[PDB]
Amino acid sequence: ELDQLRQEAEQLKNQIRDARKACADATLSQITNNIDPVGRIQMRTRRTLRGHLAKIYAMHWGTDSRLLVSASQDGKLIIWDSYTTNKVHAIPLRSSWVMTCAYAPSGNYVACGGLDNICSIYNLKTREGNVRVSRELAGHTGYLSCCRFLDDNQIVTSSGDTTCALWDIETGQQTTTFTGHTGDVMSLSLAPDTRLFVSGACDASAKLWDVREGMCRQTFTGHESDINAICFFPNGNAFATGSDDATCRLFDLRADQELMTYSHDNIICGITSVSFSKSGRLLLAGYDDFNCNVWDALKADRAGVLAGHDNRVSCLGVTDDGMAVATGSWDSFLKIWN
Amino acid sequence: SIAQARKLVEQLKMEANIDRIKVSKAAADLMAYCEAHAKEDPLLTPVPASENPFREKKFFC
Amino acid sequence: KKILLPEPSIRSVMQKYLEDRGEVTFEKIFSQKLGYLLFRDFCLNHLEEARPLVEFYEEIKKYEKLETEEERVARSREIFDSYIMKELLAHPFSKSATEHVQGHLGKKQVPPDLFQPYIEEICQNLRGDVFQKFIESDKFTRFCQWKNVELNIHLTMNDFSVHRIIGRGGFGEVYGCRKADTGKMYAMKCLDKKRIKMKQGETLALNERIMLSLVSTGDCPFIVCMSYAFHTPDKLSFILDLMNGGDLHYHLSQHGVFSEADMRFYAAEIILGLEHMHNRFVVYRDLKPANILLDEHGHVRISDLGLACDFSKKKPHASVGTHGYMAPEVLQKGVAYDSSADWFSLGCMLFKLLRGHSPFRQHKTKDKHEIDRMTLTMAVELPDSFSPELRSLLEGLLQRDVNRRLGCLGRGAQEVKESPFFRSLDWQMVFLQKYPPPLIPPREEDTKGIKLLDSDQELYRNFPLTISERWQQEVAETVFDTINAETDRLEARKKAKNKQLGHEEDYALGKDCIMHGYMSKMWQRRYFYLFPNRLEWRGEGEAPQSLLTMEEIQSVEETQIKERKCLLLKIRGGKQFILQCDSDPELVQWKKELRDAYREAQQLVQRVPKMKNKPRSP
Ligand SMILES: O=C(N[C@@H]1CNCCC[C@H]1OC(=O)c1cc(O)c(C(=O)c2c(O)cccc2C(=O)O)c(O)c1)c1ccc(O)cc1
Numbered sequence A: 001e002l003d004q005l006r007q008e009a010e011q012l013k014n015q016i017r018d019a020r021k022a023c024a025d026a027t028l029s030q031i032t033n034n035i036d037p038v039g040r041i042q043m044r045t046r047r048t049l050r051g052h053l054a055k056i057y058a059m060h061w062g063t064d065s066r067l068l069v070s071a072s073q074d075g076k077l078i079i080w081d082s083y084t085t086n087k088v089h090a091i092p093l094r095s096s097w098v099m100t101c102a103y104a105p106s107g108n109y110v111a112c113g114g115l116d117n118i119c120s121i122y123n124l125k126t127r128e129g130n131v132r133v134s135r136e137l138a139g140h141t142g143y144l145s146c147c148r149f150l151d152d153n154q155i156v157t158s159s160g161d162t163t164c165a166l167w168d169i170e171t172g173q174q175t176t177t178f179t180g181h182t183g184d185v186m187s188l189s190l191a192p193d194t195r196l197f198v199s200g201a202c203d204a205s206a207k208l209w210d211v212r213e214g215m216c217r218q219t220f221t222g223h224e225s226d227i228n229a230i231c232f233f234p235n236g237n238a239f240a241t242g243s244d245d246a247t248c249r250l251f252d253l254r255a256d257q258e259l260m261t262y263s264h265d266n267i268i269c270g271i272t273s274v275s276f277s278k279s280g281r282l283l284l285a286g287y288d289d290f291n292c293n294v295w296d297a298l299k300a301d302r303a304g305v306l307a308g309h310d311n312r313v314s315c316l317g318v319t320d321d322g323m324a325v326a327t328g329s330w331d332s333f334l335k336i337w338n
Numbered sequence B: 001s002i003a004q005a006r007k008l009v010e011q012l013k014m015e016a017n018i019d020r021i022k023v024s025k026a027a028a029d030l031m032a033y034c035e036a037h038a039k040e041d042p043l044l045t046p047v048p049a050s051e052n053p054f055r056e057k058k059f060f061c
Numbered sequence C: 001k002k003i004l005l006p007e008p009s010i011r012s013v014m015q016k017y018l019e020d021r022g023e024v025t026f027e028k029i030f031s032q033k034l035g036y037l038l039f040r041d042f043c044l045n046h047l048e049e050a051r052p053l054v055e056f057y058e059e060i061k062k063y064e065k066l067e068t069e070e071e072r073v074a075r076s077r078e079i080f081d082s083y084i085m086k087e088l089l090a091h092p093f094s095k096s097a098t099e100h101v102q103g104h105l106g107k108k109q110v111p112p113d114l115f116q117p118y119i120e121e122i123c124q125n126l127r128g129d130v131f132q133k134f135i136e137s138d139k140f141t142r143f144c145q146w147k148n149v150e151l152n153i154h155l156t157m158n159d160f161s162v163h164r165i166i167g168r169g170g171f172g173e174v175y176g177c178r179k180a181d182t183g184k185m186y187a188m189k190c191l192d193k194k195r196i197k198m199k200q201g202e203t204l205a206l207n208e209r210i211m212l213s214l215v216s217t218g219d220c221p222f223i224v225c226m227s228y229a230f231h232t233p234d235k236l237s238f239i240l241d242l243m244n245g246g247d248l249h250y251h252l253s254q255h256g257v258f259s260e261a262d263m264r265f266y267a268a269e270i271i272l273g274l275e276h277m278h279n280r281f282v283v284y285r286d287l288k289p290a291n292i293l294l295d296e297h298g299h300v301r302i303s304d305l306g307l308a309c310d311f312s313k314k315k316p317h318a319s320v321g322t323h324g325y326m327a328p329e330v331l332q333k334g335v336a337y338d339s340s341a342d343w344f345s346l347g348c349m350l351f352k353l354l355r356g357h358s359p360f361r362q363h364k365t366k367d368k369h370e371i372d373r374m375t376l377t378m379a380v381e382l383p384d385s386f387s388p389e390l391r392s393l394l395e396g397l398l399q400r401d402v403n404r405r406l407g408c409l410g411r412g413a414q415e416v417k418e419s420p421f422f423r424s425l426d427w428q429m430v431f432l433q434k435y436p437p438p439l440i441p442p443r444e445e446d447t448k449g450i451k452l453l454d455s456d457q458e459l460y461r462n463f464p465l466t467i468s469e470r471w472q473q474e475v476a477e478t479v480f481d482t483i484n485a486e487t488d489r490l491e492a493r494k495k496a497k498n499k500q501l502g503h504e505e506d507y508a509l510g511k512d513c514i515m516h517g518y519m520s521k522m523w524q525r526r527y528f529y530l531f532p533n534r535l536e537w538r539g540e541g542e543a544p545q546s547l548l549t550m551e552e553i554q555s556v557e558e559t560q561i562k563e564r565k566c567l568l569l570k571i572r573g574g575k576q577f578i579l580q581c582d583s584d585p586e587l588v589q590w591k592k593e594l595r596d597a598y599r600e601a602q603q604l605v606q607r608v609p610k611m612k613n614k615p616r617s618p
């Protein structure tokens, strides 16, 4: 009876492999083989944001493409003005072990959390001006790895308890829970339409979740190690991942399989972050070797390298308006590039 | 458990029961997206120095 | 020259030092002079709910100290009339407790015990929320300022202003001196380290320090007590009670023999002194008049504690003492003994004050072995002039059989007290040093072939000591009142100054700071904050712009920098960070709380893939 279902457990897995090979008529690199290359992209560092006193673990742009939050080992969140270097707010946290952070699309709130196992929501403009905690989200029995807002009153978090969860910020409860991963969840990315979101984990698999219905539609394996970061393609029908194997991978949803692999033989360390340019032609990957690389997403060629950090690039992100890229590092500085 | 095994079989039937399009069509639609919006991407199509905040822009809102 | 208290921020370190040793309990603080004084300040001045309770406690204590029964009956009813009608209308007392008190009162019987039930019930109410409110208050902050000073006591000859010689010996000479810290009058006893090595007085000198320490607790008026002990590179040193009246052997030369009426006085105070030593399981073993001293008023104490001995864990069997005053069981080869011996010495000494020599000393002989042979064999022939109640006493003391001797049958000192000789005295009054005294006093290069090795110095490694209630009493009766006011002015002035500067509130509040305080980096003094994952620091002006993470720390060790103990952090990048501290409690706690900090930190990271160190090199 236990045996009886473990045969069908793999009879269906093989039904899926064969189901997918039927679609593998041609590869992306073949179709793209015709288009002009993007050519060398020599972005220079245009700002250095100095303030944090120790490692940066996570950053996040605001929707205005000017303000950005950054979490840090030093126990502070900072909100910077990229155009001038000015700090808008230096928020000191109630727990030193922060790992993630996030800016509301509205820009009225920010969030963070870590080994405290709580996603704390901060109100960036009180009825006076003082920045204060407006809610703590206790629930997970594991470290908070990442989190993103849908709107002011909803947030989605991932945790090392091997699960994700969608929150209702007012009541501070879990509307929906996302069980499925068999290892620590590490990152997530919202679809632009928001009805979906993808997640990545230490089981070397990523999963597309049906936000509203609350279940896993698809599971994309292929990676040989812990998927550390993940990112949606602007149209929302494909996403990229980064892993400790030293490769990025592009997965398409409608094709239901891996499309592309980005990996030079010289690149042997892990990937810590991923982000597409505004059109989606460029895939920027952050590496443990201090460099952010720039991939031609369609041709799988390395367009160029963002190199100017003295330690791991621990996070990155393009602005909405595509004007600039920001890299955050263990050297304690963020840097804006273009 | 048997609950744990039956959970998986129900899910793996749920993953097989999605329809799929051809990778040829999958790639062709992405390449359609990049080509299209390439004009508006400033990391590919740079804008005037004065209109870019991180180069020579002077006036701000 | 004068005591400067540390700043209030010391609390952060000290509280954690005390919490770890369980010394932050009502019963631990309350039973300390400085702890009590600060507590009662708070209750009286800064908490109306506690005021009557303490006021009432202090009133009961003054009643205990009343001399006689007729004074008590007065104060007894006097007390129940006033405060009790306020407290019974409040915080009521128990029926069970009032029953006993009112039972005695109804019969007009008034012991000190009378109010003991009300003491216990007061404490019940003082140790609950009233205590926790005290811990949160600035008077606990002030207790910690003082406690820091106590546990950081490092003494040298700079601290004392030495005056005149008042005694020679074998290894050194006793002086009279003032402590510049408080301006307290003391007697110094400096033993030369080059002399002690020349005489093999190694276990002997190290013994005295232990013996002085064991007797000095409890606040006794009849033994020359120690407050401190310390050493310099070439000398040992004791700080003992001052006595400017000379020894009883010198006065016996100038006064001749004393009368019974006068011998009683000395005997009483000497007895109560011995009682103190015996209840603390210490045998003195050399009671002679030369070891008894007089203060300027005339009263006596016991002094030379070199030959004394602990007998709790095992009983001694040596032949220790002066040859005229040793008990028979001391002189015998392997006969063990306890407090027994000091009673035989009392008889021998009390005889000499009446007749001018030891009863076993005869023809002014100077033959130790003959004198010892009188003790064991000769029955002591008592004079006829002697009173009957005196004969009763002495032959009780000089009885050879230990089972047949007074003060060894079970009740110890009490058997001698209740003797027929002391039938007139009220022993409480003796203790209170209230009876009038009979007498009031009127107004080298031999060790140059012997070097001091650093192996010999380690034998005195744990020599220095400071008796806690002694130092606390010293401060209490001198500089404690005036220094609190001065450091109160500073701490209000610094706050008033910071208010004009637009005071920024503590960087440590509202976060998860473990602890915080001053230290010096490398010297550069800076204020630190230890967080669970890092150790920040700032200069006097701005917030911390510099730090060191916990994962960077390989090991926290301790090492020397120009003969001062410091912490030696080893950073992962092959670098070293050195920290100095303003006091020893700080050194112990920083060392600990970092060792716990980085060890916790490094395990937490292990789990987290987002924070740990992954492979790079092929
Ligand atoms: O103890 C005092 N005086 C004593 C009285 N006994 C008679 C001898 C004089 C004097 O003793 C000393 O000055 C003295 C000095 C010493 O260095 C030593 C010792 O080194 C010593 C010792 O500490 C323990 C055992 C033996 C000896 C020794 O010298 O043989 C000593 O025993 C007495 C005394 C104590 C306090 C005070 O305020 C004033 C005086």
Ligand SMILES: [Mg+2]
Binding pocket: C316, C317, C318, C319, C329, C330, C331, C332, C333, C334, C335, C336, C337
């Ligand atoms: Mg013996």
